[PDB]
Design a protein around this ligand. Structure first.
Ligand SMILES: c1cnc2c(c1)NCCC2
Lengths: 39, 156
């Protein structure tokens, strides 16, 4: 049995921690909703 | 149940203790999450029940109490924020410049941030605080790191 609990408001935070790169990838999406890399 | 707009954890007591299986967004009276989080099951909010209303396994999305309401889109140029809600941890904003998933059916923004599987359904926002998609359906690239699509539904 699943239940939900509030965790916060949805707002942009000024000066949030900035990280992560920006990869450009060729991908395929199957009928089951799974993404895979095309090489 | 609680109907206030915002981000919510999706919990289960079926396993050991209380386990966070995902996250979702309450907006305009509708609860939005990824299909793989709930598998389309009903949800509880206090003494109230939320029934599924729309879902699609291929998009990996589901809405409860009404139709999908989120329609903002990444502009293809600006940094966005993942409002990560990890299991047992406080909601935290992480800013990043999305990459791209290129597919035979068009390109989708993607965020290269790695969080526990229970963070699936966390919202990705633009600078106006609008939800441009949900985090948690993606791929594991060569170096073993996780890249999530920015998955957005259609507002009918
Ligand atoms: C963050 C969100 N979803 C997932 C992961 C991480 N890792 C594995 C596949 C699903």
């Amino acid at each position: 049995d699943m239940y939900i609990e509030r965790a916060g408001d949805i707002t942009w935070e000024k000066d949030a921690e900035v990280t992560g790169n920006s990869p450009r990838l060729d991908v395929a999406l199957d009928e089951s909703g799974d993404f895979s890399l095309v090489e | 149940g609680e109907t206030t707009d915002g981000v919510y954890r999706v919990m289960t007591r079926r396993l050991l203790g209380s386990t966070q299986v995902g996250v979702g967004v309450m907006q305009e009276g509708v609860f939005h999450t990824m299909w793989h989080v709930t598998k389309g099951a009903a949800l509880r909010s206090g003494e109230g029940r939320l029934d599924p209303y729309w879902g699609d396994v291929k998009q990996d999305l589901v809405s409860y109490c009404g139709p999908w309401k989120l329609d903002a889109a990444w502009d293809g140029l600006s940094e966005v924020q993942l409002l990560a809600v990890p299991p047992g941890e406080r909601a935290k904003n992480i800013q990043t410049l999305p990459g791209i998933f290129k597919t035979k059916d068009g390109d989708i923004g993607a965020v290269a941030l790695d969080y526990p599987a229970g963070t699936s359904g966390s919202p990705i926002l633009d600078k106006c605080g609008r939800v441009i998609g949900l985090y948690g359906n993606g791929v594991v690239i060569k170096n073993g790191s996780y890249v999530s699509a920015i998955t957005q539904g259609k507002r009918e």
